[PDB]
Write a protein that binds this DNA or RNA. Structure first.
Lengths: 58, 65
DNA sequence: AATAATCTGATTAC
DNA sequence: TGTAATCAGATTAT
């Protein structure tokens, strides 16, 4: 059993897309700042970027 | 580029983690979350620990074979 | 130099 | 769906 899929809101997604434009590989401080800003865990942020790098590469 | 500092597990947390690994190498979300409570580690660190644990297991086996 | 953290590439599951 | 979650495998780097 997997954790239940997070459903990112559009305001959350906008914050993450803007950060992605600054860097596709944010460091720990940047990922934690974002998590705090979006009420998400650094882990979900890390996974969003991982998947967002995938799609872009694909 | 800064990464998260290495987390250091206590002998107590390490014992709890390995005994869980012995019961199960692919702990579901509930298990990992339970483990997190017991040990006081975040579940994110637990998932990473199991990942690295399964990899130590695989490397040892290939090595000795 | 052992292993926590990060990445990609495939894949699952919803 | 498209995409969030997971995994193995490889690697970085404390």
């Amino acid at each position: 059993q997997r954790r239940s899929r997070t459903t990112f809101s559009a305001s959350q997604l906008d914050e993450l897309e803007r950060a992605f434009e600054r860097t596709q590989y944010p460091d720990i401080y940047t990922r934690e700042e974002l998590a705090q800003r979006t009420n998400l865990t650094e882990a979900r942020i890390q996974v969003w970027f991982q998947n967002r790098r995938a799609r872009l590469r694909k």
